[PDB]
Design a protein around this ligand. Structure first.
Ligand SMILES: CCC1=C(C)/C(=C/C2=NC(=C\c3[nH]c(/C=C4\NC(=O)[C@H](C)[C@H]4CC)c(C)c3CCC(=O)O)/C(CCC(=O)O)=C2C)NC1=O
Ligand SMILES: CCC1=C(C)/C(=C/C2=NC(=C\c3[nH]c(/C=C4\NC(=O)[C@H](C)[C@H]4CC)c(C)c3CCC(=O)O)/C(CCC(=O)O)=C2C)NC1=O
Ligand SMILES: CCC1=C(C)/C(=C/C2=NC(=C\c3[nH]c(/C=C4\NC(=O)[C@H](C)[C@H]4CC)c(C)c3CCC(=O)O)/C(CCC(=O)O)=C2C)NC1=O
Ligand SMILES: CCC1=C(C)/C(=C/C2=NC(=C\c3[nH]c(/C=C4\NC(=O)[C@H](C)[C@H]4CC)c(C)c3CCC(=O)O)/C(CCC(=O)O)=C2C)NC1=O
Ligand SMILES: CCC1=C(C)/C(=C/C2=NC(=C\c3[nH]c(/C=C4\NC(=O)[C@H](C)[C@H]4CC)c(C)c3CCC(=O)O)/C(CCC(=O)O)=C2C)NC1=O
Lengths: 99, 162, 160, 66, 99, 162, 160, 162, 160
């Protein structure tokens, strides 16, 4: 025979039986996954505006989406803040002054 | 939001179980369709403006009252907001298609959408019709195999709004 | 997950996924079967890996199972080996996910606080994780061992 | 007056960060005039050393046009 | 007293903005654990779409200055103190001349 | 917030009254209890980690499903947040005891806690059980009179949560 | 390039590159000779592709070369074909780089403003680049054609 | 930043040329070095904390006064900052080696490092010695061939600091 | 110290110090004499405290001085005792300051990173600090022991 019992560590970590309704609620219980499924935009680069143009542009559009809660192309935000974006890219101003 | 992989991982985590044969089966199923999904996503991304063009053309043709005065899509502002919403739906449907899961549709799109549309006076049934129109245009664009699987998420959005 | 990370990034810039992101997902999906094989290999031997890692740990750290130690006794040793089992399960989840996100989100954030409240020694946890890494990389080939040891090293560095 | 060009170093004392922070310690920025008192006070309260401040836009001593 | 731009400046010139966001990062939902009720109120605000509701989520905070009942004068250690002050008064009384 | 002194000040300020003999008696009673309150506060501060360890140990022994996979205290984040909430309750109970007044418990703890937990799926009965375990541990450390006083603030928290 | 994207992704999280990124870089390098061959194929047939694309563009959009069109006249038609030549060279650059970054930062960023300054219609641009897609991907095998069509489709969607 | 491939693309874009034989040759050179670069980067990624340990040990052994009181590395904060800076230098040298170009060092590391160090009081000569100490340690692990290539970027960092 | 905290709190509100803050500073300067007496007492007993603290640490944790231990060797044991001397000096500074702010600024911020780089075990730090606390409190009277042990408790919590 040489019976081989279930190890104790297997039982020490078992979960109560859960149907699909309980599985779904156990997945989505605590603080929302949006807290960790997101990007935080910051001006890490100090290089000139010639390179890393795209990451400045992404940070600028993220600033628009944070201050105005969504994209605002219908209001021509780019031309309204073109001078401001230009000062941000050439590093005359910081992100806080842009905001 | 969770994709199919994280869906299986999360169910087995809240059940405290190691992956069994069924889990690896669902994982193989997701990995087998990944090229189809990626190709469809790229096609939709390249032709997003087109899809919005035909879908909005169809929606406003079948319902001319929306863009005439007294309609919810009568102004340049409200017309642009309508096509912006249609772009939202297409982009997030493509996200759900890539993820192989409708979780992002509940979390990022449908949450508060009905009450916001009721608060704004947006017609929900007409919005569902526009979503269906995007369904036909996108299906004609990406081919039948990808068409059915994009239609899954389109009808999910339609049912969530309705 | 890689797909979730790509979609989260694309959603952050409120855009469609770039061709580079689609190519990244193509690569991640092409390697899906191999990663599933690695994870299944680790899964088929959970009991062996846990027992061998526990033996190696308690030989390195006999005090943890000495009287007055944290894992002293049958039930506390069972709780210890159960923690090792939890981390092996998260390592397999990370293998199939393609990144350390399941490990990070279930077993790393706030782990020092949890073990500080449980009076569980962090160096003991590091030794246990390294023991699991050695045992589990033993059962794999050269190509798979590096990938699995990446997750094990991530967890070990997180613990200390 | 309307504009100060301020070059400032802000060291760190509270903690050592995983982030690079070369962005935030040594910097030059353009702060508009009636923001400068608050900005200088905040920089002094963080422990930084203001290296230089300059006039750029307006003219010192002007009465109107401020 | 001052209107809109001074109010925005007061927010952005606060110590809190400087410590959390500094000069480089775009603000974001913080999911604040403290103080009490900040988490539900912030989540109600951030789970709402634009123009989803015009109602005020935080109209004001109900004052906690005075409750109804539970004077805490029946509190047992308050009772012990009221017993001890009697002893102190008695000692002061015996400090007076006997006549 | 309020303490005993501020509570007497407010009740004599609403009436526009200078302090009477009764108010001076109340102030004397608080000034008499101040030494015991400071002693209990110092003892609790020195032993906060011990209290949290023991109380969470009883809580998770009685409710093992909270730390089994899928339970509300199952992940390192959620376990850490659970013991952090216990530390919060201990700290604000100590503040309240030192003030001699439960207003801080309503203002800085109980306000929105119930629907915070309900929106997160945190079980409220198990939190109350944790608070009771914390009360039992604290009573053994601070002595009988301080135990009775500290029980008032722990019971205020438990009743506000329930 | 792919390597630059992986490095920036690692830098954003402030970490060394994960084995997934290193495997992606290995695959990118291993595909180098094939992509240089593809770029050389498209480069040696530069004149064929540009003239066939211009012919198809003018056939489907005669209004461009009709009076009142932006390409009417010899010099304007020449500068039209010249911009087609620019975009073809950008596509070869993107092919060798493995991503659309050269195209993005030489020809996409600010293109709308530039063609608004020149009265150049964007539908005309997208039709030209789709004609150039067809002409160029006709010359390549299926595996090459699809991968080049990714860059051409990205260009078409970026101009639209 | 730009890598070797992007450098060739930019030098051909400035002159408006399609790729000729020479450009393809330089590309082939980079894809020839690619496997070596990837292997070295992975080796360093596995051994980053180690390499930092021996590098800091060598720096402080050769210049002990930096960590005794009065040295700029004397405190837990300042010692932690020193090893943090060394870890940054190693990580960015690895990035530059993998890219094959030194633009990342000037764009990220060296842009404003002189002003910051001199204003803080950080001694430049000691930091350069630390760069050399790190280079010597890394060369032992990477292998004889990759050692010189990584040393290229280490001397770039040092000369930018010097 | 207490004066600096009162000043920075007043300056945060851009006000003069309130009569309550001034009374707090008055109590602080009143307690200053006893604080200097305590710090003098610990400063006189430098070598005693270091010697018994090191002996108890090495007997309680022989592994540190044993082969493979972090403090193996005369120079490494000397560095161990040197760290103990540093921390005792910091505790004297805290006693005179009235708070743990000097301990915080010189020896607590980034200590975990320092001892990770040095491969110094943090539990060994906690035990050495506890031994120092025991010796210092023993050499003191009943009154001084409480306030001195508070700083050692803070320091051990910082290491733990
Ligand atoms: C990504 C998830 C998401 C969704 C789905 C979303 C929908 C949405 N649509 C809105 C406006 C609108 N939406 C529409 C769309 C309607 N027009 C016609 O009637 C059609 C039937 C229908 C579209 C097919 C219109 C006309 C408005 C303008 C309402 C107004 O300004 O009065 C608004 C108000 C704020 C704004 O304009 O940005 C939201 C929040 N927002 C989101 O963040
Ligand atoms: C990713 C690119 C990047 C780097 C590398 C960088 C370095 C850097 N080092 C700093 C401070 C420091 N750096 C050092 C390190 C020096 N001290 C010793 O003499 C050693 C010889 C030498 C290190 C080998 C020290 C001790 C400090 C603290 C100075 C202070 O007390 O303010 C600071 C000021 C803020 C802080 O302390 O975190 C920066 C920004 N910044 C960047 O944006
Ligand atoms: C000072 C007054 C105050 C309190 C008490 C408070 C509690 C509080 N608990 C939270 C989450 C939580 N709270 C708990 C508590 C545990 N769940 C277990 O089942 C136990 C029954 C229970 C404790 C005994 C858990 C598990 C979470 C989830 C954390 C997460 O999802 O990451 C959150 C969400 C924010 C965050 O976690 O960062 C808050 C605000 N907030 C306050 O301002
Ligand atoms: C999925 C993420 C996760 C982890 C990792 C986790 C760990 C965890 N380990 C626990 C107990 C324990 N953990 C250990 C393990 C230690 N013993 C030795 O010192 C070793 C150094 C070390 C293991 C290698 C022991 C001995 C106990 C029992 C404590 C006791 O009985 O007092 C507990 C208390 C509740 C219970 O036992 O059911 C938790 C929550 N919980 C989680 O939700
Ligand atoms: C004033 C604040 C301050 C502190 C605290 C500090 C700690 C410190 N300890 C060091 C070495 C050391 N420290 C120790 C002590 C450990 N050995 C055992 O593990 C024990 C658990 C433990 C002693 C209780 C050892 C063994 C070394 C030698 C490290 C080595 O050579 O590998 C070093 C390296 C530089 C040198 O050796 O002079 C520092 C900077 N530095 C500071 O500026």
């Amino acid at each position: 025979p040489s019976f081989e019992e279930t190890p104790k560590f297997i039982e020490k970590g078992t979960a109560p039986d859960r149907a699909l309704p309980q599985i779904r609620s156990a997945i989505n219980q605590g603080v929302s996954k949006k807290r960790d499924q997101r990007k935080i935009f910051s001006t890490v680069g100090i290089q000139t505006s010639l390179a890393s143009r795209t990451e400045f542009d992404a940070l600028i559009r993220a600033a628009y989406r944070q201050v105005f809660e969504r994209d605002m192309d219908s209001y021509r935000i780019t031309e309204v803040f073109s001078v401001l974006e230009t000062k941000l890219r050439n590093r005359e101003i910081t992100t806080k002054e842009f905001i | 939001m969770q994709d199919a992989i994280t869906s299986v991982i999360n169910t087995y985590d809240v059940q405290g179980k190691y992956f069994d044969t069924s889990a690896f089966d669902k994982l193989k199923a997701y990995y087998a369709t990944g090229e189809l999904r990626v190709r469809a996503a790229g096609t939709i991304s390249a032709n997003a403006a087109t899809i919005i063009k035909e879908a909005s053309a169809k929606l406003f043709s079948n319902q001319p009252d929306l863009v005439r005065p007294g309609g919810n899509a009568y102004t340049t502002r409200r017309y642009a907001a309508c096509v912006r919403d249609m772009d939202y739906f297409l982009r997030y449907a493509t996200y759900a298609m890539l993820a192989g899961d409708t979780s992002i549709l509940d979390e990022r799109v449908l949450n508060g959408l009905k009450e916001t549309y009721n608060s704004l006076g947006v017609p929900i049934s007409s919005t569902v019709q526009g979503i269906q129109a995007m369904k036909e245009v996108t299906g004609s664009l990406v081919g039948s195999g990808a068409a059915k699987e994009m239609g899954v998420y389109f009808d999910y959005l339609s049912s969530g709004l309705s | 997950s890689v797909v979730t990370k790509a979609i989260v990034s694309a959603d952050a810039e409120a855009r469609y996924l770039s061709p580079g992101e689609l190519d990244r997902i193509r690569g991640f999906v092409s390697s899906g079967e191999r990663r599933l094989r690695v994870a299944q290999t680790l899964t088929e031997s959970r009991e062996r890996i846990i027992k061998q890692a526990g033996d190696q740990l308690f030989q390195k750290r006999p005090d943890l199972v000495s009287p007055g130690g944290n894992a002293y006794g049958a039930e506390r040793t069972a709780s210890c080996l159960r923690d090792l089992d939890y981390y092996l399960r998260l390592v397999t989840f990370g293998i199939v996910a393609g990144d350390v996100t399941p490990i990070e989100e279930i077993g790393v954030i706030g782990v020092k606080e949890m073990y500080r409240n449980l009076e569980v020694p962090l160096p003991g946890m590091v030794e246990a994780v390294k023991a699991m890494k050695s045992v589990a990389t033993g059962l794999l080939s050269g190509d798979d061992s590096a990938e699995v040891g990446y997750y094990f090293d991530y967890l070990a560095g997180a613990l200390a | 007056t309307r504009l100060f060009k301020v070059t400032a170093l802000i060291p760190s004392y509270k903690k050592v960060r995983g982030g690079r922070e070369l962005q935030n310690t040594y910097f030059t920025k353009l702060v508009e005039y009636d923001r400068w008192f608050a900005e200088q006070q905040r920089i002094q309260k963080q422990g930084g050393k203001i290296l230089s401040v300059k006039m750029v836009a307006g003219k010192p001593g002007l009465n109107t046009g401020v | 007293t001052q209107g809109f731009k001074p109010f925005i400046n007061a927010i952005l010139d606060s110590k809190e903005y400087g410590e959390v966001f500094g000069d480089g990062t775009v603000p974001y939902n913080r999911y604040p654990t403290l103080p009490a009720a900040n988490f539900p109120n912030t989540e109600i605000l951030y789970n709402q779409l634009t123009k989803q509701s015009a109602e005020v989520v935080v109209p004001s905070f109900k004052p906690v200055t005075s409750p109804r009942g539970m004077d805490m004068s029946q509190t047992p250690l308050m009772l012990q103190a009221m017993g001890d002050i009697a002893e102190a008064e008695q000692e002061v009384a015996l400090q007076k001349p006997l006549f």
